[PDB]
Amino acid sequence: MDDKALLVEVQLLESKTYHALSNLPKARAALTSARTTANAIYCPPKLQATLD
Amino acid sequence: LPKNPDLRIAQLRFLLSLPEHRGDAAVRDELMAAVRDNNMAPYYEALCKSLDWQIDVDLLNKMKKANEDELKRLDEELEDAEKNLGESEIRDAMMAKAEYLCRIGDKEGALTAFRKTYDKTVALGHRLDIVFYLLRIGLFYMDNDLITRNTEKAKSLIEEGGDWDRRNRLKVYQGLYCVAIRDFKQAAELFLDTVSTFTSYELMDYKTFVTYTVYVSMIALERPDLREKVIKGAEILEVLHSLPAVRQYLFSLYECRYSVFFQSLAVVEQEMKKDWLFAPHYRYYVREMRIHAYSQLLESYRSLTLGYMAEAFGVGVEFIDQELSRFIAAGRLHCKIDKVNEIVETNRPDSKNWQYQETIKKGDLLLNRVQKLSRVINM
Amino acid sequence: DDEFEEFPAHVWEDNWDDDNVEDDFSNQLRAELEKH
């Protein structure tokens, strides 16, 4: 569904929780998914900063 | 796949069939709850016979009648399927019947029904499912002959055509059997190969599987492989975050923190005595892990004083002296004690000396074979 | 081949050290820490 910005934020949170749990490959996979979704919509400065 | 039988049942029964833990009544409540839920009248009778329990006739009769009615209706449906429906549904009827026999606890009847279903069925996937039910019965009843025969059957089927999911489930079954028969090396291999894709939730939850993988890997893997595949394992660290004691055990060994390591090994010994699959391995596992810790400490020393060893391991000097003497006598450690002035010299063999000894051993074996062959043939 | 009939006639690779009888390692270590 819609709100791809919320989808990007949730995927970023997934990646961040994987990083905190030490599952680094899964954290990187979630990060890459979040970046792929983010480079298809408007990313406000805050969201772009969080992704970066 | 389904829980049939729930191996938690066997876990509870074994854990109950142990001194100093009989009649705690929590284990008994859990097991009775499961038995009443699944109407295991025959398994209940077997448990009563084994443990000399006060049989509750009132509820036993109800379970017997429920099981008898279920069996009769399943058999009637099977006969109806034979009379009207074709093989495609007769197979399902027999299969459901056999599943119900396993659920109740009719071992021999379930095996016979599954053999008939296997003979009838031609679908490769359903053949694999039957073989996996047989393997789970084998694990539940710890019948090594059936377990190994059905393991070979499953491997043969996979070679004759299989898929990744059944391959992984068979890998987990093989690892469980290896842990049962004390083949921790192969158990480590299988468990680490299937750790990232554990799907067999019918045997044990992912946390228990990860604890087993950690234990077996620690006892089977050298330090480099351990660091590469356990200490640096993403999917193992993720679960070890939830499991704070297994992590302390593993990292106490890895980071050469030996007092904490013996603490963790004692708690592991207790846990894994209580366990049902590792139960006839706790003494051996503790002994081997102690030997691993001693060899690890001595690996970076040429002369280690007993006082320092005792302080490092958080024990006394008599304890370390006795353990070291026992393991050196058994030949498991490369070190010689010196008690008049307490020091543990390290007599590790040089590379060339070890090579010479290996050459002598292997050449002796090969020369014995050559001598036997020559004397067989020259006459 | 020849048979010496003239002379009347755990899956594991178990080890000698396994047969020893001693307290559980947990008990041993508990006593050690207790007295030290």
Added chain:
Amino acid sequence: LRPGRIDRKIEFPPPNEEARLDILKIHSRKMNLTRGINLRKIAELMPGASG
């Protein structure tokens, strides 16, 4: 293109989703496919795609 020189002419249309399912099976045989994976769905997702 005259007959006698080229007696027969075989056209090779792009697969019709059934040939695509066949090609997916052929090229995924040597692969660790997870359960619940639907090569038919992938074939449908690939319209007018060549082998």
